[PDB]
Amino acid sequence: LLRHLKISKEQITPVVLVVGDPGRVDKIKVVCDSYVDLAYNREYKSVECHYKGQKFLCVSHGVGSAGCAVCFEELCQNGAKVIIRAGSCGSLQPDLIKRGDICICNAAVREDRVSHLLIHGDFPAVGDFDVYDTLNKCAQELNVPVFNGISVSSDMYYPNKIIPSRLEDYSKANAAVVEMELATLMVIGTLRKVKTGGILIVDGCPFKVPHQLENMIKIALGACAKLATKYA
Amino acid sequence: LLRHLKISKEQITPVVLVVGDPGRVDKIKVVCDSYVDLAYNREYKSVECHYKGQKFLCVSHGVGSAGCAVCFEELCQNGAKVIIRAGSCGSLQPDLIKRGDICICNAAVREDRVSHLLIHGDFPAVGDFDVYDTLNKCAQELNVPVFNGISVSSDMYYPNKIIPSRLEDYSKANAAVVEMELATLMVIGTLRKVKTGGILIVDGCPFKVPHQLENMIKIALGACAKLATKYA
Amino acid sequence: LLRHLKISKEQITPVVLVVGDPGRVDKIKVVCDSYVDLAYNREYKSVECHYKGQKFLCVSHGVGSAGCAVCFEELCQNGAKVIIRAGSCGSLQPDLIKRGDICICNAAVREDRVSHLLIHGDFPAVGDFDVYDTLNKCAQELNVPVFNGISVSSDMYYPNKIIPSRLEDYSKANAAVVEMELATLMVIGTLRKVKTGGILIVDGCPFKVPHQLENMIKIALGACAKLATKYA
Amino acid sequence: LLRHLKISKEQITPVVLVVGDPGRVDKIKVVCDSYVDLAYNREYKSVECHYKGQKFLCVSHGVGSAGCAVCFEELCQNGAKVIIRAGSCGSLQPDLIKRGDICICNAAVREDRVSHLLIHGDFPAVGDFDVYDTLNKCAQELNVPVFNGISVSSDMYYPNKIIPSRLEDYSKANAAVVEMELATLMVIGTLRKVKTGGILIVDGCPFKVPHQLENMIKIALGACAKLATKYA
Amino acid sequence: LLRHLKISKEQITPVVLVVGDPGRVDKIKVVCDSYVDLAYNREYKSVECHYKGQKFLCVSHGVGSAGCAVCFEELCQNGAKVIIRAGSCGSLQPDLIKRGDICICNAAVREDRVSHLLIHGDFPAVGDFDVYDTLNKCAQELNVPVFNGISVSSDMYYPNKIIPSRLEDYSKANAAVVEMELATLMVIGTLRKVKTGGILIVDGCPFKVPHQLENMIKIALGACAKLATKYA
Amino acid sequence: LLRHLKISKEQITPVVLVVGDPGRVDKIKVVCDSYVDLAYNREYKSVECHYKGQKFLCVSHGVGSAGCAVCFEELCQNGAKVIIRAGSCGSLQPDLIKRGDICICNAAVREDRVSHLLIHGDFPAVGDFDVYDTLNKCAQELNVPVFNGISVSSDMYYPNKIIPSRLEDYSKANAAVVEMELATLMVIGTLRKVKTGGILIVDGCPFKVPHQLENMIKIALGACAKLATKYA
Ligand SMILES: O[C@H](CNC1CCCC1)Cn1c2ccccc2c2ccccc21
Ligand SMILES: O[C@H](CNC1CCCC1)Cn1c2ccccc2c2ccccc21
Ligand SMILES: O[C@H](CNC1CCCC1)Cn1c2ccccc2c2ccccc21
Ligand SMILES: O[C@H](CNC1CCCC1)Cn1c2ccccc2c2ccccc21
Ligand SMILES: O[C@H](CNC1CCCC1)Cn1c2ccccc2c2ccccc21
Ligand SMILES: O[C@H](CNC1CCCC1)Cn1c2ccccc2c2ccccc21
Ligand code: NA
Ligand code: NA
Ligand code: NA
Ligand code: NA
Ligand code: NA
Ligand code: NA
């Protein structure tokens, strides 16, 4: 069994949908056609989802880059071929990207540590195009407006007042949103030959919805099934 | 209510015992005299422990520095005065520090990112002496052998083969153990005027027990009650 | 007139094809339907290309990141909306990617300086998806096999023996090819809201063709015309 | 003979008191019960002190981290087991820590270079607890009020106006005092398995006494004798 | 033949005058006594100059550090013994150093990347004294007033508004002028045992002539002939 | 009075000769024509030397960059115009530069901290040419063979075995010698508009004489008198 996910390599599907909150797994699994509870250890909850004729895991990775890296490494080193993260984010363009808006991200700022412990900082955190394109196409098909851009992946949710946050810098650099895991997923995926992507819903802004969440989940599930079809 | 711990500032005790696994909270709370379940959100589980006439929270912080920082910031900014982490670690001195051995750590290597987003890297991750001294004294009283030293707090649990891990370097520098949160707790505590400490049990070695865990938990609970007495 | 390109903002087309060698501009312009020589100053040669009913500039940017940044900034700050770089590269996967092979790159390693003088190193050098997708589709249409991957953009062509080159590190990290400008183009484009892309032909390997070049040029010209159609 | 201290390894006592000024050695040695002048080379003056039945060296280390490292390395590599630095410092909390106040420090900011040439910057500069506890206890016994905290060890005494000093940053981070050697002593001690500590008297503030110095010296001498007793 | 300069090692003279613009080579070669056109590839134009009885190449290196490094490495690894750069620069002391003024520089700020890929950043970018002295003496002989100082060699000509430029910092540090190649030439020369120097004419200021250019060219040619005499 | 040198600004001569050891001041002052003892505080000993009709201070600066910076800042901010360091060094080219050989250095590697706390690391540590030329000319006049090159100024005299020393790297980069202060003197001098230089005698090699010292001192004194003549 995987040391922390507590599942076997035989239970790892080619496509895996990852989310941060173990509770969101339970909310996702009930909107699939059926499911099989697999394991629940620490913040890592794993369920096998059945959707549109296809099967793919949904696994929670917990909050933050170092914790999610444990999850992602165990999946990538044991059979996963596609990992899509669905999660929440904050808007770095509050005049254009509002609460409830959905963003499909192709790349990320590596404001973590574990990616730098894996490869030099000059290396890009970048998603797989085919995964990005699949998420965009599933949204168009469901007639759900979405934004596209770069996510700032930061290990600091609560800032202090001594070292200035770089969020305003990255906003001026046209980063779209902020969250805490995407860049780690992307680097690990690139290093391990796993195709990755990310779809995120805005729930706040670091500067001065149920319908949207349902839509984002449908997009994420729709894309997982489309990609899973290729590997079946 | 605190955004992620989902408890109120009135429920925050002066002393808090933190652990990584929500399950370990449940294992700890039943060996106290009594307890009050408070909240469970994401990987953050909070319980009020009653032990030796005193009361103190036990809260899980999840795996990894960025995730535990969310927990620690919410406690430090809302009334906590003492935070002791009890957890697991790997031995960096396998000829001297063996599986099951217990280490009480006074300082830590800042191989994370969030501490660096809070204060310059030259700043030390260091625990409070009185907390360190209390944990040592509780162990002596229970006649439980312990080691003392520096912990390497690393955001990388699974290494890759491109960038060498610094664990051997830090072993040669006489670091005792490795784990993934202590340095983050220490810096946040220093910045926020919260006294911190750490007690850890060895469960592996990155290089070439139930009785010990019970002992470590007794030491941690013993020290929490001693410190809580001062604030009551 | 632009200070170094020596053309006017009115002569800047929405789509620009950039190459390193002023001579390659002359080789490209004669395979278009017609052309208009615009300017030639330093290594910056500018020609207006007419191809498949569309018009777009072809401009040389010279060798190396600091020199090409002068070219790219003048285009991005004066009307350019799409910049595609067509150039040469070295294979970082010599068993899979051979001399003459063509690579369409979505992202790049920022081993330059000017990108870091513009934005923090954690920021990704990433291309525009629509541009990447257009280059891939034009190749499929012409039945020309291509590879896709990350380029290492390095300011050091001739290494010395004191500081080890990171090329082997990035090869192990699954970077596909090496060249000297793509990452600079990508960051400048992201900062300036300009869509960028890159198509490259392998002409060597840092470790132990005319038909292919013609094909790569046809792909690059084909994609420029397709994108130019949108802005006309 | 040691290359720069000009004493023999047989003259090295288990406990050594270090100070910056060779003159302070002469002021310290005359308040002991008796003494033996050993050597004086460059700024390194060594005397054997006899106090409360015990013997321990008092050695000057000069101004600044690179110069004191020569002194500390020669002691640690030739028999020293405990090194206590007694010196002066500036207040980083001028509303709380005033001129003449005494601070016993447990850790330090590594704003030097030599510590970084010895071990990675993430490593903590931290003192030995038993040494820290001994200095605190000797002060309580003599009824001498003291403060405890982190020292900023900076290689820059005279700032210029181009690069901002980090002293205000570290003050906001709750560093207590500033001086120029403690962090270097701590890292060298940790690497060499030597127990270190520091006691400092405030003589200024970087921002907007004889009785206290006598008290601080008594505390330092008192602690040296207590520690020396263990090794005799 | 050299890969990019397209000349043979037999055509490399001991002394080489380098300039950025291929056009400036043509302007320089006609004021010599005679010349021999050698090659023109990319931005690298090479001509053999005959002046005051001596012979030395004049070669263009293009804009920017990464591009000029290709030129400089090919010369230094194939016989060159002295390389003098003559070029343009911006004044960092606008009250003292005005448009048209000439500066002979002995050292440079390494705001590039390739020098750092060759040797650690602490290493100085410094010119050869004898070359510096020769340029100064040739100016005195021609009664041409000149300034002397440090050049900032920056890879960023067009700044953006997110990361502050260090030009004001270096101006306060008494750097005289800014340009984009000198530091790269100096480090490569030091590493390869080639004597280097730089003479520059002010053509702007980053903050709030034909006679001078002719004078600067005469100085540069005068110094090349003097140095070439030693090797003939 | 200057805070640490304990002399007045009126006692500061335009030319100052600095050495590390207070004892070397006493050895130097007796070979001048006459002298005036000024002050002795900590490792800072100041004497007014009379030589060949001129007067100039000789001041000891102690061991190491942070300590000598205190000395150099007090001189540069209070009237000094020329500072020459005479000292010892280790050979980084043991096959060419042997024990007793004398090296006159024009630039230095900034392996310190205080220079970096004053100005960004890309800035060169470089000496004044006129000072360098004067030292070379005084040696030629006395028929004393000398070498010229770059010094590595390192804060680490005693290396440990965890982090590799860069001395071999810098030797391969053609650095001539190693010592511990020159780079700090050069940066401080450049920032403060003080002309600096360095002359050094080899007394060891980090890898696998009285007549020479007398010669080096004569050269240093000879150059001080020549420079002092200009300011009198
Ligand atoms: O809300 C998610 C954060 N979700 C996680 C936080 C803890 C568990 C789930 C996005 N987000 C940020 C991510 C990183 C740093 C700062 C922010 C931020 C600021 C304002 C609004 C949203 C923000
Ligand atoms: O076992 C804990 C790790 N516990 C956490 C891991 C995930 C959840 C709980 C200590 N530990 C390490 C911490 C950091 C990096 C490497 C190691 C390591 C290697 C071997 C043995 C123990 C090790
Ligand atoms: O050939 C292009 C380089 N083209 C430019 C070089 C000068 C003008 C045109 C790709 N390339 C590299 C780019 C960067 C660093 C190293 C290499 C490299 C090594 C071997 C083979 C190809 C290589
Ligand atoms: O006074 C000691 C400094 N003692 C040494 C200085 C030279 C010899 C002895 C503490 N101190 C500082 C140490 C570091 C950097 C700045 C300061 C500082 C500023 C104001 C007041 C005190 C200060
Ligand atoms: O003009 C040369 C630049 N020449 C080159 C530029 C492109 C081809 C030739 C000096 N220069 C700068 C060099 C670096 C960065 C900024 C500046 C700058 C700013 C104002 C005035 C002059 C300046
Ligand atoms: O001897 C002087 C050092 N003098 C000072 C040392 C303490 C007081 C005086 C040159 N030197 C080095 C300077 C820096 C780092 C390493 C070395 C080194 C190694 C071997 C031989 C000479 C060496
Ligand atoms: Na977590
Ligand atoms: Na983390
Ligand atoms: Na160029
Ligand atoms: Na460049
Ligand atoms: Na000193
Ligand atoms: Na120092």
Cβ-defined contact of A67 to B70 (cutoff 8 Å): no
- Radius of gyration of chain B from its Cα atoms, rounded to whole angstroms: 16
Distance spanning both ends of chain B, measured CA to CA: 23
Helix (H) or strand (E) holding F29: helix F22-29
Interface check for D172 against chain E (CB to CB < 8 A): the answer is: no
Interface check for F191 against chain D (CB to CB < 8 A): the answer is: yes
Residues 6+ apart with CB under 8 A from C164: none
Dihedral angle, C-alpha E63, E68, E70, E73, nearest 10 ° = 170
What does residue A115 show for φ and ψ, rounded to 5 degrees? -60, -40
Q: How far apart are CA B18 and CA E141, in angstroms?
A: 78
Q: What are the residues whose beta carbon lies below 5 Å from ligand 8 (ion)?
A: A 64-66, 155; B 64-66, 155
Give the number of whichever ligand sits closest to the CA of residue A91.
Answer: 1
What does residue C141 show for φ and ψ, rounded to 5 degrees? -55, -35
Experimental method: X-ray
Q: How far apart are CA C109 and CA C170, in angstroms?
A: 9
Contact partners for chain A, using 3 or more CB pairs closer than 8 A, are B, C, D, E
Q: How far apart are CA A39 and CA A60, in angstroms?
A: 11
Paired strand residues for D19: D60
Q: How far apart are CA C85 and CA C182, in angstroms?
A: 7
Of A226, F128, B110, which Cα lies nearest the Cα of E149?
A: F128
Distance spanning both ends of chain C, measured CA to CA: 23
State the count of interchain CB pairs (< 8 A) between D and F: 144
CA D21 to each of CA D59, D200, F71, F160, F181: distance values in angstroms, whole numbers, following the listed order: 9, 14, 15, 27, 20
Among residues 129-158 of chain F, which lie with CB inside 8 Å of chain C?
none
Cβ-defined contact of B169 to D106 (cutoff 8 Å): no
Q: How far is the CA of C31 from the centre of ligand 3 (A)?
A: 26
Residues 6+ apart with CB under 8 A from A1: A7, A8
Q: How far apart are CA E155 and CA E171, in angstroms?
A: 17
Of C30, C37, C178, which Cα lies nearest the Cα of C111?
A: C178
3-state secondary structure of F144: coil
Of D10, D18, D8, which Cα lies nearest the Cα of D131?
A: D18
The binding site of A for a purine D-ribonucleoside comprises 4, 180-181
Q: How far is the CA of A27 from the centre of ligand 10 (A)?
A: 51
Q: How far apart are CA C68 and CA E157, in angstroms?
A: 11
Looking at chain E, which residue has its C-alpha nearest residue A172?
E162
List chain A residues with CB under 8 Å of D173: 162
Cβ–Cβ under 8 Å, residues D28 and D58: yes
Tokens of D53: 């039945």
Interface check for D172 against chain A (CB to CB < 8 A): the answer is: yes
Q: How far apart are CA C218 and CA C135, in angstroms?
A: 10
Interface check for F169 against chain E (CB to CB < 8 A): the answer is: yes
Neighbours of E50 (CB within 10 A): 15
Burial of B119 (0-12, 13-18, 19+ CB in 10 A): buried
Tokens of A8: 């076997």
Of E170, E181, E231, which Cα lies nearest the Cα of E206?
A: E170
Q: How far apart are CA E49 and CA E17, in angstroms?
A: 9
Mutate to test the pocket of ligand 6, among F24, F89, F213 (most ligand atoms within 8 A of CB): F89
In the 8-state DSSP scheme, what is residue D9?
G
Question: How many Cα atoms occupy the beta-carbon half-sphere of B165 within 13 Å?
Answer: 20
Q: Is C126 in the pocket of ligand 3 (CB under 6 A)?
A: no
Helix (H) or strand (E) holding F28: helix F22-29
Pairing of strands B82-91, F177-179: unpaired
Tokens of F20: 């590390």
CA B225 to each of CA B33, B104, B145, B167: distance values in angstroms, whole numbers, following the listed order: 12, 17, 20, 35
Q: How far is the CA of B157 from the centre of ligand 2 (A)?
A: 6
In the numeric block, the tokens 């060419």 are attached to F96
Cβ–Cβ under 8 Å, residues C177 and C91: yes
Cβ–Cβ under 8 Å, residues F4 and F74: yes
Tokens of F132: 């360098």
User: C186 to chain E nearest CA, in Å?
Assistant: 15
In the 8-state DSSP scheme, what is residue F136?
H
Interface check for D179 against chain F (CB to CB < 8 A): the answer is: no
Tokens of C28: 């490209």
- Radius of gyration of chain C from its Cα atoms, rounded to whole angstroms: 16
Tokens of B36: 């009050």
Looking at chain F, which residue has its C-alpha nearest residue B169?
F162
Cβ–Cβ under 8 Å, residues E85 and E19: yes
Cβ-defined contact of B190 to D169 (cutoff 8 Å): no
In the numeric block, the tokens 């604030």 are attached to B231
What does residue E168 show for φ and ψ, rounded to 5 degrees? -65, -40
Of F87, F92, F45, which Cα lies nearest the Cα of F182?
A: F87
Q: Which segments of F32-177 does DSSP mark as H helices, in order?
A: 65-76, 114-118, 129-141, 167-172
Q: Is D180 in the pocket of ligand 4 (CB under 6 A)?
A: yes
Looking at chain B, which residue has its C-alpha nearest residue D150?
B124
Q: Is the dihedral of CA A191, A197, A203, A208 positive or negative?
A: positive
In the numeric block, the tokens 């489309």 are attached to A226
Residues 6+ apart with CB under 8 A from E92: E152, E167, E170, E171, E175, E176, E177, E178, E205, E206, E207
DSSP assignment of B118-149: HS-TTS-EE--HHHHHHHHHHHHHTT---EEE
Cβ–Cβ under 8 Å, residues A117 and B111: yes
Contact partners for chain F, using 3 or more CB pairs closer than 8 A, are B, C, D, E
Helices (H) and strands (E) in chain A — how many of each? 7, 10
Tokens of F231: 């300011």
Cβ–Cβ under 8 Å, residues C160 and C62: no
In the numeric block, the tokens 């996967």 are attached to C93
Of D82, D182, D61, which Cα lies nearest the Cα of D129?
A: D82
For the stretch D45-53, contacts whose Cβ atoms lie closer than 8 Å and that sit 24 or more positions apart, written own/partner, are D46/D5, D46/D6, D46/D7, D46/D11, D48/D11, D48/D13, D49/D17, D49/D221, D49/D224, D51/D221, D51/D224, D51/D225, D52/D221, D52/D222, D52/D225, D53/D225, D53/D229
Burial D7-22 (b: 16+ CB within 10 A, else e): beeebbbbbbbbbbbb
Documented resolution in Å? 1.9
DSSP assignment of D90-125: EES-TTTS-TT-EEEEEEEEEESSHHHHHS-TTS-E
Q: How far apart are CA B107 and CA B198, in angstroms?
A: 9
CA D161 to each of CA D165, E75, E168, F111: distance values in angstroms, whole numbers, following the listed order: 9, 41, 12, 22
Nearest CA to ligand 2 atom 16: B157
Paired strand residues for A179: A153
Q: How far apart are CA C193 and CA C195, in angstroms?
A: 7
Q: Is F6 in the pocket of ligand 4 (CB under 6 A)?
A: no
In the 8-state DSSP scheme, what is residue D175?
-
User: D114 to chain E nearest CA, in Å?
Assistant: 14
Pairing of strands C147-154, C177-179: parallel
Q: How far apart are CA D147 and CA F104, in angstroms?
A: 49
Of C78, C27, C76, C84, which Cα lies nearest the Cα of C56?
A: C84
**A9-231 — its CATH code?**
3.40.50.1580
What does residue B66 show for φ and ψ, rounded to 5 degrees? -65, -40
Q: What are the residues whose beta carbon lies below 5 Å from ligand 10 (ion)?
A: C 64-66, 155; E 64-66, 155
Burial F195-227 (b: 16+ CB within 10 A, else e): bbbbbbbbbebbeeeeebbebbbbbbbbbbbbb
With residues binned 3-state (H G I as helix, E B as strand, rest as coil), the percentages for chain F, rounded to 5, are 35, 30, 35
Residues 6+ apart with CB under 8 A from C143: none
∠C190-C194-C198 over CA atoms, to 5°?
A: 85
Burial of E4 (0-12, 13-18, 19+ CB in 10 A): buried
- Tell me the Ramachandran region of residue E109: left when phi exceeds 0, alpha when psi lies from -120 to 50, beta otherwise: beta
Sequence ranges of the domains in chain B: 9-231
Whether C203 sits among the annotated catalytic residues: the reply is yes
Burial of D130 (0-12, 13-18, 19+ CB in 10 A): middle
Name the residue among D42, D70, D160 with its Cβ closest to that of F43: D42
∠F4-F9-F10 over CA atoms, to 5°?
A: 135
Interface check for F161 against chain B (CB to CB < 8 A): the answer is: yes
Neighbours of F96 (CB within 10 A): 11
Question: How many Cα atoms occupy the beta-carbon half-sphere of C83 within 13 Å?
Answer: 36
Q: How far apart are CA D93 and CA D168, in angstroms?
A: 10
Q: Is C23 in the pocket of ligand 3 (CB under 6 A)?
A: no
Q: How far apart are CA F45 and CA F7, in angstroms?
A: 10
Cβ–Cβ under 8 Å, residues E118 and C156: yes
Q: Which segments of B17-166 does DSSP mark as H helices, in order?
A: 22-29, 65-76, 114-118, 129-141
Q: How far is the CA of C69 from the centre of ligand 9 (A)?
A: 10
Cβ-defined contact of E172 to D163 (cutoff 8 Å): no
Helix (H) or strand (E) holding C141: helix C129-141
Q: Is the dihedral of CA B76, B82, B87, B92 positive or negative?
A: positive
Question: How many Cα atoms occupy the beta-carbon half-sphere of E67 within 13 Å?
Answer: 31
CA D108 to each of CA D147, D175, F92: distance values in angstroms, whole numbers, following the listed order: 15, 8, 34
Cβ-defined contact of D169 to A161 (cutoff 8 Å): no
List chain C residues with CB under 8 Å of B161: 172
Distance spanning both ends of chain E, measured CA to CA: 23
Q: How far apart are CA A10 and CA C115, in angstroms?
A: 44
The ligand 6 atom at the shortest distance from the C-alpha of residue D67 is 7
